[PDB]
Design an enzyme around this catalytic site. Structure first.
Site, PDB file in Angstrom:
ATOM      1  N   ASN B   8       0.710  -0.985   0.022  1.00  0.00           N
ATOM      2  CA  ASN B   8       0.049   0.164  -0.026  1.00  0.00           C
ATOM      3  C   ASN B   8       0.866   1.292   0.092  1.00  0.00           C
ATOM      4  OD1 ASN B   8      -2.077   1.906   0.542  1.00  0.00           O
ATOM      5  ND2 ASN B   8      -2.742   1.558   2.354  1.00  0.00           N
ATOM      6  N   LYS B  10      -0.001   4.252  -0.207  1.00  0.00           N
ATOM      7  CA  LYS B  10      -0.643   5.430   0.528  1.00  0.00           C
ATOM      8  C   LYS B  10      -0.685   6.741  -0.317  1.00  0.00           C
ATOM      9  CE  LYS B  10      -0.666   3.042   5.013  1.00  0.00           C
ATOM     10  NZ  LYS B  10      -0.526   3.259   6.470  1.00  0.00           N
ATOM     11  N   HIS B  95     -10.086   0.923   4.122  1.00  0.00           N
ATOM     12  CA  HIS B  95      -8.865   1.153   4.832  1.00  0.00           C
ATOM     13  C   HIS B  95      -9.085   1.973   5.928  1.00  0.00           C
ATOM     14  CE1 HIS B  95      -4.618   2.149   5.933  1.00  0.00           C
ATOM     15  NE2 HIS B  95      -4.283   1.132   5.288  1.00  0.00           N
ATOM     16  N   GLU B  97      -7.677   4.190   7.398  1.00  0.00           N
ATOM     17  CA  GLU B  97      -7.342   5.730   7.013  1.00  0.00           C
ATOM     18  C   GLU B  97      -8.636   6.369   6.298  1.00  0.00           C
ATOM     19  OE1 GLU B  97      -3.742   5.619   5.153  1.00  0.00           O
ATOM     20  OE2 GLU B  97      -2.743   4.973   7.188  1.00  0.00           O
ATOM     21  N   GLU B 167      -6.483  -4.904   9.898  1.00  0.00           N
ATOM     22  CA  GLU B 167      -5.758  -3.946  10.545  1.00  0.00           C
ATOM     23  C   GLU B 167      -5.760  -3.835  11.984  1.00  0.00           C
ATOM     24  OE1 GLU B 167      -7.643  -0.933   7.554  1.00  0.00           O
ATOM     25  OE2 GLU B 167      -5.539  -0.101   8.100  1.00  0.00           O
ATOM     26  N   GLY B 173       0.533   2.653  15.822  1.00  0.00           N
ATOM     27  CA  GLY B 173       1.092   3.928  16.492  1.00  0.00           C
ATOM     28  C   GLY B 173       0.307   4.274  17.604  1.00  0.00           C
ATOM     29  N   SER B 215       1.748  -3.722  11.427  1.00  0.00           N
ATOM     30  CA  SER B 215       3.356  -3.693  10.794  1.00  0.00           C
ATOM     31  C   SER B 215       4.033  -4.688  10.197  1.00  0.00           C
ATOM     32  CB  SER B 215       4.064  -2.981  12.053  1.00  0.00           C
ATOM     33  OG  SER B 215       5.604  -2.839  11.581  1.00  0.00           O
TER      34      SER B 215
END
Lengths: 249, 249
Positions: B8, B10, B95, B97, B167, B173, B215
């Site tokens: 990906n 992005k 996704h 995001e 995901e 993070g 990750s």
């Protein structure tokens, strides 16, 4: 005050069609645009291509949308860093199709607009009210909110790179139909709201281009441009073929 | 059941970087992918370009997002008609995001997924829960909703063109960190929810690829693939340079 004729290709064209249109435009429009600014907004998938074709011409290329960030982790979004690299420096914000079908709020428009203007882009900011808003007497409240919340916190020194468009969404296949006087009275209002936006806005409000974004065609363009506060068109269907697009200039 | 390693890109790459990466990939990955399916998802602005580069290779190209319509009046959106024309037949939906920064709901995912699968596209459908959801004990409820509402009304005969990714947004993070056993237990659940989705789903639930989308790096890929229900990776940063991407295969 610039007169601008901007073609919005929406999601209506194949890449084959976009490339044919681009070449046709490059061959014809620069010779007839004269005092008018010509602009086109291809689909993002086609921008690189179209941009290469129009390079060296007076026809300006814009993106139909972007996200308010440099290169970063935003799956599905396009960055102004990516656009700048291929020479695209104009971005449309707040199109009615994006407000309606992609749920874009005044506030999300405002974050795009702040980012773009801070970073030397030109912004084409779209406003307009629905039939239900108009029928409920909310024309003023909606437009005034779209302008105030859309342009909140934007440094006045960047307004030279701001263009507006008014979309009479209420007439847009509703099928109410908008007259040039009806468009005029909105453009005058919008111009008055800009004149109240920040201290010393009087000169910017008189120089800012406000384009009409309802149904624009070779048979009604001259009647629209005669109105005192209408400075051009953000044009849908008629922009998507060379003969109708060239007829606007 | 296919093993798939999907990169990906992005909104992280310039066009220069995307093209260099594409050529690097084409020269190296087909010789080492072997049994694994290789896939890449460039920014839409770069898809035409990248797609031309990878044409003729075994490296599959996908779009990071699209709208659920053929060519039509949707400013800012990309159509599966436009993607098909340049040979892109894989589209990512849902996704994290996009769910988080673009407000995409399960229902909007579902309309994309119905449109894509009906029209012979492969869909890479992303699911996952936030730290707040996990901390509140909503892992099951959120994943189960993302699957049930995301895949509502999809004809079972199209599931052969559906790929899933999990995901672990909670670890992304946050900085919680997800172990291969923690990933495994989610993938097993997700696979069990597919087995309950429609009458006779038992075989499809066992053949569907479920990729891990936390990750993923050359130093942890083998440990992830050893888990019984983990079928590959949807990979972020490590996919964006040839040396790390090639290290996954």
């Amino acid at each position: 005050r610039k007169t601008i004729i901007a073609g919005n290709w929406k999601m209506n064209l194949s890449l084959k069609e976009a490339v044919f249109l681009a070449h046709s435009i490059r061959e014809k429009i620069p010779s007839i645009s004269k005092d008018k600014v010509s602009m086109v907004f291809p689909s993002t998938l086609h921008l690189e291509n179209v941009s290469k074709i129009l390079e060296g011409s007076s026809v300006i290329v814009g993106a139909q949308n972007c996200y308010h960030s440099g290169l970063a982790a935003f799956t599905g979004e396009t960055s102004p860093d990516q656009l700048k690299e291929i020479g695209v420096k104009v971005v449309m914000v707040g199109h009615s199709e994006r407000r309606q079908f992609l749920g874009e709020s005044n506030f999300f428009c405002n974050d795009k607009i702040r980012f773009l203007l801070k970073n030397e882009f030109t912004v084409l900011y779209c406003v307009g009210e629905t039939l239900s808003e108009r029928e409920s007497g909310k024309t003023l409240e909606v437009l005034s909110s779209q302008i105030r919340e859309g342009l909140k916190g934007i440094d006045s020194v960047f307004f030279s790179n701001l263009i507006l468009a008014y979309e009479p969404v209420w007439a847009i296949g509703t099928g109410k139909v908008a007259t040039p006087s009806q468009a005029q009275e909105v453009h005058s209002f919008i111009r008055k709201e800009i004149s109240g936006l920040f201290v010393g806005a009087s000169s910017i409000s008189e120089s800012i281009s406000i384009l009409y974004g309802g149904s624009v065609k070779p048979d009604n363009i001259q009647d629209l441009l005669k109105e005192k506060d209408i400075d051009g068109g953000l044009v849908g269907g008629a922009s998507q073929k060379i003969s109708s697009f060239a007829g606007l200039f």
